[PDB]
Design an enzyme around this catalytic site. Structure first.
Site, PDB file in Angstrom:
ATOM      1  CB  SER A 215      -0.992   0.008   1.129  1.00  0.00           C
ATOM      2  OG  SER A 215      -2.036  -0.929   0.894  1.00  0.00           O
TER       3      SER A 215
ATOM      4  CE  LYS B 234      -3.579   0.902  -1.328  1.00  0.00           C
ATOM      5  NZ  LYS B 234      -4.402   0.402  -0.210  1.00  0.00           N
TER       6      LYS B 234
ATOM      7  CD  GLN C  94      -8.060  -8.599  -0.288  1.00  0.00           C
ATOM      8  OE1 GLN C  94      -8.552  -9.725  -0.434  1.00  0.00           O
ATOM      9  NE2 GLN C  94      -7.269  -8.282   0.733  1.00  0.00           N
TER      10      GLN C  94
ATOM     11  CE1 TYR D   2      -6.274  -0.001   1.520  1.00  0.00           C
ATOM     12  CE2 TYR D   2      -6.408  -1.863   3.019  1.00  0.00           C
ATOM     13  CZ  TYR D   2      -5.817  -1.250   1.926  1.00  0.00           C
ATOM     14  OH  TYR D   2      -4.790  -1.888   1.283  1.00  0.00           O
TER      15      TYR D   2
ATOM     16  CG  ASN E 158      -6.211  -2.739  -2.298  1.00  0.00           C
ATOM     17  OD1 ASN E 158      -5.361  -1.859  -2.286  1.00  0.00           O
ATOM     18  ND2 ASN E 158      -6.351  -3.602  -1.307  1.00  0.00           N
TER      19      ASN E 158
ATOM     20  CD  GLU F 286      -3.727   6.149   5.984  1.00  0.00           C
ATOM     21  OE1 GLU F 286      -3.455   5.719   7.145  1.00  0.00           O
ATOM     22  OE2 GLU F 286      -4.144   5.419   5.073  1.00  0.00           O
TER      23      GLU F 286
ATOM     24  CE  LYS G 111      -1.578   3.853   2.779  1.00  0.00           C
ATOM     25  NZ  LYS G 111      -1.579   2.589   3.559  1.00  0.00           N
TER      26      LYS G 111
ATOM     27  CB  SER H  91       1.344  -5.623   4.257  1.00  0.00           C
ATOM     28  OG  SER H  91       1.639  -4.922   5.454  1.00  0.00           O
TER      29      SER H  91
ATOM     30  CG  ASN I 203       2.068  -8.658   6.457  1.00  0.00           C
ATOM     31  OD1 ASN I 203       2.068  -7.814   7.350  1.00  0.00           O
ATOM     32  ND2 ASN I 203       1.013  -8.904   5.703  1.00  0.00           N
TER      33      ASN I 203
END
Length: 349
Positions: free
Chosen positions: A61, A64, A117, A148, A150, A261, A304, A307, A332
């Protein structure tokens, strides 16, 4: 001073690498315009290759923020406005509920309950992706709830790319990465660089937009340095980075920007952990919209997490202190732990 900074970063990293069984971890710090690298353990346990500042990690992420930078470039070129209807930039979406959804709602996860997702039934296939969005219907009013997603920021990146008349991946490689000075940053790792690509320890629709980037600690700190000093880039790209430093609404202690963020700085470690927690990723939250968009600068931490299967990334910078930090790992491991490391280092500086 060299000894102090190593003791600070070792004390933050070593216990957490131990307790989370992280094979390899790369730290990059920008301190008053000076880079500092700390590399730990193994890029690959199987062949004993060591982590360096040039090791490539999956950043998930964190991708992004790159996506948001491309959008910032399309905004700077007047190819799109955040208040545009999404269907403006893709004819196949005209007649769909994307007639009623803004680019801003897609970018900031408030389109009305686009899921975490794409369903498994949706394969990495342009027609399947087109048809998914055409049939999609919101659960609640656009602009009301952060979930949140994708599919949400994926569509934001895809549409920013359409506004510029080229595929997303092409623009990232041909324009974005060269403009940011990034030669160790990849959506598709060249065969020649594969020896630098760390192993992860445990191909999707619009994966490039959401989860696509592989990069080194040194390249990701170059990106953080650009974020800290947009004024050092050519003006279109200066403007593109500034568009990622604009807050739209708050959930709890967090101000949502494009990719980034933000939190007030200082703030407790526990509150920075709660901003980056599983409920923030997984549950919808009512937003408190700001009267007007807020500059994300001064006494603030922009961050940010990201993973993939096998990898765990964290990036944070404090504009008003010219302080930047990168933590890339080939496990992760929990966001709470990434923030634990980061907070010890940023506290210590």
């Amino acid at each position: 001073p060299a000894d102090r900074l190593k003791a600070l970063v070792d004390a933050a990293v070593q216990p957490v690498m131990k307790a989370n069984d992280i094979p390899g971890l790369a730290v990059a710090i920008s301190l008053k315009g000076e880079p500092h690298y700390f590399s730990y353990g193994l890029a690959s346990k199987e062949d004993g290759r060591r982590v360096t500042p040039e090791t490539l990690f999956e950043i998930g992420s964190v991708s992004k923020t790159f996506t948001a930078t491309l959008a910032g470039y399309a905004l700077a070129q007047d190819k799109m406005r955040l208040d545009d209807r999404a269907s403006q930039h893709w004819p196949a979406l005209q007649g769909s509920r994307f007639d009623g959804i803004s680019l801003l709602d897609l970018a900031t996860y408030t389109a009305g309950g686009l899921p975490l997702q794409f369903p498994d039934s949706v394969q990495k296939d342009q027609a399947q992706i087109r048809d998914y969005y055409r049939q999609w219907q919101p659960t609640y009013a656009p602009g009301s709830q952060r979930l949140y997603s994708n599919p949400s920021i994926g569509l934001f990146g895809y549409l920013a790319a359409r506004s510029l008349g080229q595929p997303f991946e092409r623009l990232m490689e041909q324009q974005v990465f060269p403009a940011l000075g990034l030669e160790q940053t990849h959506l598709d790792v060249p065969e020649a660089a594969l020896a630098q690509y760390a192993q992860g320890y445990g191909p999707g629709p619009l994966d490039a937009e959401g989860h696509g980037v592989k990069t080194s600690a040194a390249d990701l700190l170059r990106f953080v340095d650009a974020n800290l000093h947009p004024e050092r880039l050519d003006r279109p790209w200066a403007q593109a980075l500034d568009a990622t430093h604009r807050g739209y609404y708050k959930v709890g202690d967090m101000t949502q920007g494009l990719g980034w963020e933000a939190y007030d700085w200082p703030i407790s470690l526990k509150r920075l952990q709660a901003g980056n927690s599983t409920p923030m990723a997984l549950q919808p939250h009512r937003i408190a919209r700001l009267p007007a968009p807020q500059a994300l600068e001064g006494q603030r931490l922009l961050n940010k997490t990201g993973s993939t299967n096998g990898f765990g990334a964290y990036v944070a910078f404090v504009p008003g202190r010219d302080l930047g930090l990168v933590i890339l790992a080939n496990r992760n491991y929990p966001n709470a732990e990434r923030v634990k490391i980061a907070y010890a280092i940023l506290s210590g500086l």
